[PDB]
């Protein structure tokens, strides 16, 4: 019972961005939401006076509808306000706990509240929308965890103490927990944690594996009868691949090529050439040594669609600097489309990359914007949203990363 | 003192109130002013000020005569407000009603009062003659026309007005657009004149003179460029001028009606008509016309001749979309819930970049409508589309790009969408193999095409006033020409890679259109890459060749 003064950054104004068409299913979800949530005094309605707009959206999450608020523009805005642990990659379990809920206890300074306008829409403008703002502490606004911090330290400071080994690390509206446990311990003490925070009256309506995650290595082919093409293809992913690692030839392997060959052509693979192959072999599997993590610098994260379910990506701050790559994969399950695997793909290496540096990346999506704007919610079950792009030149990388 | 409250209003931070100054005006004029103002200040709409408000605004009079004020400056420096109705109804997402009455407000705005610790900047100045006398000083109580909080506080004010009444009604319908209201129920047209009649008792109450004359308006309804009758709407007729010369404004505002036309017109076009507006130097620059937009404009001439109507929204029925292909890039579509009632109608046509394919466009078309459906019936359509499932699933299988398909049907209305040409996934057998390469000097513009075979072929044309790339195109578009109906090319050009890879069926390049013919005419064709300048086979002696 106590407000925290929250100020924008100076000489900025707060948020103005537009609300997206929704759906009639999906605005009737967001009305028997918010009239709830004005009920119990969260939100309240306000008037032409206050020209700031933030977007929501209806999501799922599971049967029952869920509200998730755009706060990108605004968390851009606060900013400023006033720690991520390197050791949580290290733990073999990492379990993810939604912890929002509880951010809604705490009143908002009541001159920041403006900023946190929302608008429910209206289909084909017949209306104007129904606008709200905050009362309380919002979930996906940077400053709730920040105000919540020290509420949050008080209640896990038993827990941690009986348990010193484990790592914890708060983003948002979730909790990053992990252990080298095994897993029957490593879910017990979860459950632990799960009756401490619900003891404590905070509700907590995910478990990843850092230990398994690496730096893919580059793969080339093993024939039993080469040809000119495939000595073509091998001798253009070296090539690119040479950009990366010094120690990559291609002489001997180009030899075989020597005259103008038809591409069908059988070349047999002779031994000097095998062995500059197999030597290109090793030097892929070391990394580069130069590759660091400078915090000041944005994350990036490229993807590339390679078919059959199968979406590559690279995340780094500068061109060639890699520094995480993977491969995603989903069992298709009757419902598999290309936007789903992407969406979820998203989140998996923004989960990912959370964990390991305590931000989020920029991604360029190999997707039109607007079949993203339109189709994006339909499986997005994170409660946070990255920034993104639009990918419209065609990577002929494809086959390189694959 | 008013029933209605207020809302709070701010200056802009750190900025003070208006301290235009009040231009001469004709003794004329004055008296309208002192007329208008005292039977305005005997309704309460203004207040006679004392001396120390030290602020002003112009004011004009003009023809009955009506007072005019001029708030730009008070405008600049109030807070903005959230943005009132943007956009508006499309007639095609109105649901049938029985009866509907429309009520225009009268003096809406000055019914409704004003903040307080505001009125200070509001304050004006009627002249006195030669200045021979100071003059009189008034401020507005109620919301002053022309300011920039007007428009949105007097929705806000109007709906919360509007609560009571609707609550007590939940049957009518009551939409709100500018200071007019349109009500509509499905009583019997008695009922429903009694329920109007007790809405405009419950808004004169509040101080809201409504239509007296009965209802002022009779369908059809002029409303927005539309014409809604109790069964159809349409758009208001469209004229579309005849002109020796064409200046870039009469273009603009030429693919603007038929913009507006598109909605409810099928078969419009603009496509040749906006390039001409590509330079768009300036309003005045007269545009000669092409003989591709002469046409354009003759053929949508020739479909505005004959009317057509829309009709409006059931939520009982399903919602359908049809796409049919027009050529030369451009495709239309209809949405309609029974087979010929068409709630609307549209076009599409960009390109999206230098060149395309048919798929593609389709894939873009149906993402235009899925966006549109969204915005006007809250739902996304069934679509009918001329595409075989065959043809759609290899595209977005083997394209690049992430796409999502919603479900649809095929129907057989020619002509039909289709992959003119498929590149091979593997080189080809007894196909000869060119080893393609182009050049051109930067500064000298000229340059070459080359190839060279594993037959022993080798050949090169000469080339002027062309770059680096598109050399890497000709040299291309060379092997396609001296080959057979199989081939197998390589390149070391990843520019003309993409563009080939992209598998485009039109383009704005002559060049990459001939390319197109050729890949079409062929049976079997395999593109393949090569690091240049690295001693690769053939690539190497078609560098040396065109280096020469
Ligand atoms: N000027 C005006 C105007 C503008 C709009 Cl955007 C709507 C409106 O009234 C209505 C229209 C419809 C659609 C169907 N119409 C009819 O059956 C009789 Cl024309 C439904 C309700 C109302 Cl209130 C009037």
């Given at each position: 019972?106590?407000?925290?003064?929250?100020?924008?950054?100076?000489?900025?104004?707060?948020?103005?961005?537009?609300?997206?068409?929704?759906?009639?299913?999906?605005?009737?979800?967001?009305?028997?939401?918010?009239?709830?949530?004005?009920?119990?005094?969260?939100?309240?309605?306000?008037?032409?006076?206050?020209?700031?707009?933030?977007?929501?959206?209806?999501?799922?999450?599971?049967?029952?509808?869920?509200?998730?608020?755009?706060?990108?523009?605004?968390?851009?805005?606060?900013?400023?306000?006033?720690?991520?642990?390197?050791?949580?990659?290290?733990?073999?379990?990492?379990?993810?706990?939604?912890?929002?809920?509880?951010?809604?206890?705490?009143?908002?300074?009541?001159?920041?509240?403006?900023?946190?306008?929302?608008?429910?829409?209206?289909?084909?403008?017949?209306?104007?929308?129904?606008?709200?703002?905050?009362?309380?502490?919002?979930?996906?606004?940077?400053?709730?965890?920040?105000?919540?911090?020290?509420?949050?330290?008080?209640?896990?400071?038993?827990?941690?103490?009986?348990?010193?080994?484990?790592?914890?690390?708060?983003?948002?509206?979730?909790?990053?927990?992990?252990?080298?446990?095994?897993?029957?311990?490593?879910?017990?003490?979860?459950?632990?944690?799960?009756?401490?925070?619900?003891?404590?009256?905070?509700?907590?309506?995910?478990?990843?594996?850092?230990?398994?995650?690496?730096?893919?290595?580059?793969?080339?082919?093993?024939?039993?009868?080469?040809?000119?093409?495939?000595?073509?293809?091998?001798?253009?992913?070296?090539?690119?691949?040479?950009?990366?690692?010094?120690?990559?030839?291609?002489?001997?392997?180009?030899?075989?090529?020597?005259?103008?060959?038809?591409?069908?052509?059988?070349?047999?693979?002779?031994?000097?050439?095998?062995?500059?192959?197999?030597?290109?072999?090793?030097?892929?599997?070391?990394?580069?040594?130069?590759?660091?993590?400078?915090?000041?610098?944005?994350?990036?994260?490229?993807?590339?669609?390679?078919?059959?379910?199968?979406?590559?990506?690279?995340?780094?701050?500068?061109?060639?600097?890699?520094?995480?790559?993977?491969?995603?994969?989903?069992?298709?399950?009757?419902?598999?489309?290309?936007?789903?695997?992407?969406?979820?793909?998203?989140?998996?290496?923004?989960?990912?990359?959370?964990?390991?540096?305590?931000?989020?990346?920029?991604?360029?999506?190999?997707?039109?914007?607007?079949?993203?704007?339109?189709?994006?919610?339909?499986?997005?079950?994170?409660?946070?949203?990255?920034?993104?792009?639009?990918?419209?030149?065609?990577?002929?990388?494809?086959?390189?990363?694959? | 003192?008013?029933?209605?409250?207020?809302?709070?209003?701010?200056?802009?931070?750190?900025?003070?109130?208006?301290?235009?100054?009040?231009?001469?005006?004709?003794?004329?004029?004055?008296?309208?002013?002192?007329?208008?103002?005292?039977?305005?200040?005997?309704?309460?709409?203004?207040?006679?000020?004392?001396?120390?408000?030290?602020?002003?605004?112009?004011?004009?009079?003009?023809?009955?005569?009506?007072?005019?004020?001029?708030?730009?400056?008070?405008?600049?420096?109030?807070?903005?407000?959230?943005?009132?109705?943007?956009?508006?109804?499309?007639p095609?997402?109105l649901?049938?009603?029985?009866?509907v009455?429309v009520?225009?407000?009268?003096?809406?705005?000055?019914?409704?009062?004003?903040?307080?610790?505001?009125?200070?900047?509001?304050?004006?100045?009627?002249?006195?003659?030669?200045?021979?006398?100071?003059?009189?000083?008034?401020?507005?109580?109620?919301?002053?026309?022309?300011?920039?909080?007007?428009?949105?506080?007097?929705?806000?004010?109007?709906?919360?007005?509007?609560?009571?009444?609707?609550?007590?009604?939940?049957?009518?319908?009551?939409?709100?657009?500018?200071?007019?209201?349109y009500?509509?129920?499905?009583?019997?047209?008695?009922?429903?004149?009694?329920?109007?009649?007790?809405?405009?008792?419950?808004?004169?109450?509040?101080?809201?003179?409504?239509?007296?004359?009965?209802?002022?308006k009779?369908p059809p309804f002029l409303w927005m460029?539309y014409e809604l009758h109790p069964d159809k709407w349409t758009?208001?007729?469209?004229?579309?001028?005849?002109?020796?010369?064409?200046?870039?404004?009469?273009?603009?505002?030429?693919?603007?009606?038929?913009?507006?036309?598109?909605?409810?017109?099928?078969?419009?076009?603009?496509?040749?008509?906006?390039?001409?507006?590509?330079?768009?130097?300036?309003?005045?620059?007269?545009?000669?016309?092409?003989?591709?937009?002469?046409?354009?404009?003759?053929?949508?001439?020739?479909?505005?001749?004959?009317?057509?109507?829309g009709?409006y929204?059931?939520?009982?029925?399903?919602?359908?979309?049809?796409?049919?292909?027009?050529?030369?890039?451009?495709?239309?579509?209809?949405?309609?819930?029974?087979?010929?009632?068409?709630?609307?109608?549209?076009?599409?046509?960009?390109?999206?970049?230098?060149?395309?394919?048919?798929?593609?466009?389709?894939?873009?078309?149906?993402?235009?409508?899925?966006?549109?459906?969204?915005?006007?019936?809250?739902?996304?359509?069934?679509?009918?589309?001329?595409?075989?499932?065959?043809?759609?699933?290899?595209?977005?299988?083997?394209?690049?790009?992430?796409?999502?398909?919603?479900?649809?049907?095929?129907?057989?209305?020619?002509?039909?969408?289709?992959?003119?040409?498929?590149?091979?996934?593997?080189?080809?057998?007894?196909?000869?193999?060119?080893?393609?390469?182009?050049?051109?000097?930067?500064?000298?513009?000229?340059?070459?095409?080359?190839?060279?075979?594993?037959?022993?072929?080798?050949?090169?044309?000469?080339?002027?006033?062309?770059?680096?790339?598109?050399?890497?195109?000709?040299?291309?578009?060379?092997?396609?020409?001296?080959?057979?109906?199989?081939?197998?090319?390589?390149?070391?050009?990843?520019?003309?890679?993409?563009?080939?890879?992209?598998?485009?069926?039109?383009?704005?390049?002559?060049?990459?259109?001939?390319?197109?013919?050729?890949?079409?005419?062929?049976?079997?064709?395999?593109?393949?890459?090569?690091?240049?300048?690295?001693?690769?086979?053939?690539?190497?002696?078609?560098?040396?060749?065109?280096?020469?």
């Amino acid at each position: 019972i106590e407000t925290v003064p929250v100020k924008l950054k100076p000489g900025m104004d707060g948020p103005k961005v537009k609300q997206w068409p929704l759906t009639e299913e999906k605005i009737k979800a967001l009305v028997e939401i918010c009239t709830e949530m004005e009920k119990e005094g969260k939100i309240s309605k306000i008037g032409p006076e206050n020209p700031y707009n933030t977007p929501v959206f209806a999501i799922k999450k599971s049967t029952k509808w869920r509200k998730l608020v755009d706060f990108r523009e605004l968390n851009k805005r606060t900013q400023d306000f006033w720690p991520h642990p390197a050791g949580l990659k290290k733990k073999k379990s990492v379990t993810v706990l939604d912890v929002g809920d509880a951010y809604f206890s705490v009143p908002l300074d009541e001159d920041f509240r403006k900023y946190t306008a929302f608008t429910i829409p209206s289909i084909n403008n017949e209306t104007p929308g129904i606008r709200y703002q905050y009362n309380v502490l919002p979930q996906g606004w940077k400053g709730s965890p920040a105000i919540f911090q020290s509420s949050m330290t008080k209640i896990l400071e038993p827990f941690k103490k009986q348990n010193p080994d484990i790592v914890i690390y708060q983003y948002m509206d979730d909790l990053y927990v992990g252990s080298d446990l095994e897993i029957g311990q490593h879910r017990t003490k979860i459950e632990e944690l799960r009756q401490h925070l619900l003891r404590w009256g905070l509700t907590t309506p995910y478990e990843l594996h850092p230990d398994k995650w690496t730096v893919q290595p580059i793969v080339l082919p093993e024939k039993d009868s080469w040809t000119v093409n495939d000595i073509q293809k091998l001798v253009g992913k070296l090539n690119w691949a040479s950009q990366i690692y010094p120690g990559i030839k291609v002489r001997q392997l180009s030899k075989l090529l020597r005259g103008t060959k038809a591409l069908t052509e059988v070349i047999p693979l002779t031994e000097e050439a095998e062995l500059e192959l197999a030597e290109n072999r090793e030097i892929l599997k070391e990394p580069v040594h130069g590759v660091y993590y400078d915090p000041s610098k944005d994350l990036i994260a490229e993807i590339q669609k390679q078919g059959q379910g199968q979406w590559t990506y690279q995340i780094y701050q500068e061109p060639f600097k890699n520094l995480k790559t993977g491969k995603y994969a989903r069992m298709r399950g009757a419902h598999t489309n290309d936007v789903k695997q992407l969406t979820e793909a998203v989140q998996k290496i923004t989960t990912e990359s959370i964990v390991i540096w305590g931000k989020t990346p920029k991604f360029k999506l190999p997707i039109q914007k607007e079949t993203w704007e339109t189709w994006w919610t339909e499986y997005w079950q994170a409660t946070w949203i990255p920034e993104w792009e639009f990918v419209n030149t065609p990577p002929l990388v494809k086959l390189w990363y694959q | 003192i008013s029933p209605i409250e207020t809302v709070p209003v701010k200056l802009k931070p750190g900025m003070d109130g208006p301290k235009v100054k009040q231009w001469p005006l004709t003794e004329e004029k004055i008296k309208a002013l002192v007329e208008i103002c005292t039977e305005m200040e005997k309704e309460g709409k203004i207040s006679k000020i004392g001396p120390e408000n030290p602020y002003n605004t112009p004011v004009f009079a003009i023809k009955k005569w009506r007072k005019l004020v001029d708030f730009r400056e008070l405008n600049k420096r109030t807070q903005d407000f959230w943005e009132v109705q943007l956009g508006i109804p499309h007639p095609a997402g109105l649901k049938k009603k029985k009866s509907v009455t429309v009520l225009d407000v009268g003096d809406a705005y000055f019914s409704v009062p004003l903040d307080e610790d505001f009125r200070k900047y509001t304050a004006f100045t009627i002249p006195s003659i030669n200045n021979e006398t100071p003059g009189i000083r008034y401020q507005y109580n109620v919301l002053p026309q022309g300011w920039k909080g007007s428009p949105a506080i007097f929705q806000s004010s109007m709906t919360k007005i509007l609560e009571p009444f609707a609550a007590q009604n939940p049957d009518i319908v009551i939409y709100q657009y500018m200071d007019d209201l349109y009500v509509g129920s499905d009583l019997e047209i008695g009922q429903h004149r009694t329920k109007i009649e007790e809405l405009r008792q419950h808004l004169l109450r509040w101080g809201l003179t409504t239509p007296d004359k009965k209802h002022q308006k009779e369908p059809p309804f002029l409303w927005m460029g539309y014409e809604l009758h109790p069964d159809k709407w349409t758009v208001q007729p469209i004229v579309l001028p005849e002109k020796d010369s064409w200046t870039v404004n009469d273009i603009q505002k030429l693919v603007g009606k038929l913009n507006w036309a598109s909605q409810i017109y099928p078969g419009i076009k603009v496509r040749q008509l906006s390039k001409l507006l590509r330079g768009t130097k300036a309003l005045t620059e007269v545009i000669p016309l092409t003989e591709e937009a002469e046409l354009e404009l003759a053929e949508n001439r020739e479909i505005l001749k004959e009317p057509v109507h829309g009709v409006y929204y059931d939520p009982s029925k399903d919602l359908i979309a049809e796409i049919q292909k027009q050529g030369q890039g451009q495709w239309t579509y209809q949405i309609y819930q029974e087979p010929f009632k068409n709630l609307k109608t549209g076009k599409y046509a960009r390109m999206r970049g230098a060149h395309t394919n048919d798929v593609k466009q389709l894939t873009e078309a149906v993402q235009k409508i899925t966006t549109e459906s969204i915005v006007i019936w809250g739902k996304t359509p069934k679509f009918k589309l001329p595409i075989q499932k065959e043809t759609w699933e290899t595209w977005w299988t083997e394209y690049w790009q992430a796409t999502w398909i919603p479900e649809w049907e095929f129907v057989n209305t020619p002509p039909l969408v289709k992959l003119w040409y498929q590149l091979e996934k593997e080189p080809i057998v007894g196909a000869e193999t060119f080893y393609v390469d182009g050049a051109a000097n930067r500064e000298t513009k000229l340059g070459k095409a080359g190839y060279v075979t594993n037959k022993g072929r080798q050949k090169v044309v000469p080339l002027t006033n062309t770059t680096n790339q598109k050399t890497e195109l000709q040299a291309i578009y060379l092997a396609l020409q001296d080959s057979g109906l199989e081939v197998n090319i390589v390149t070391d050009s990843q520019y003309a890679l993409g563009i080939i890879q992209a598998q485009p069926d039109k383009s704005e390049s002559e060049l990459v259109n001939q390319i197109i013919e050729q890949l079409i005419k062929k049976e079997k064709v395999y593109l393949a890459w090569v690091p240049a300048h690295k001693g690769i086979g053939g690539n190497e002696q078609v560098d040396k060749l065109v280096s020469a």
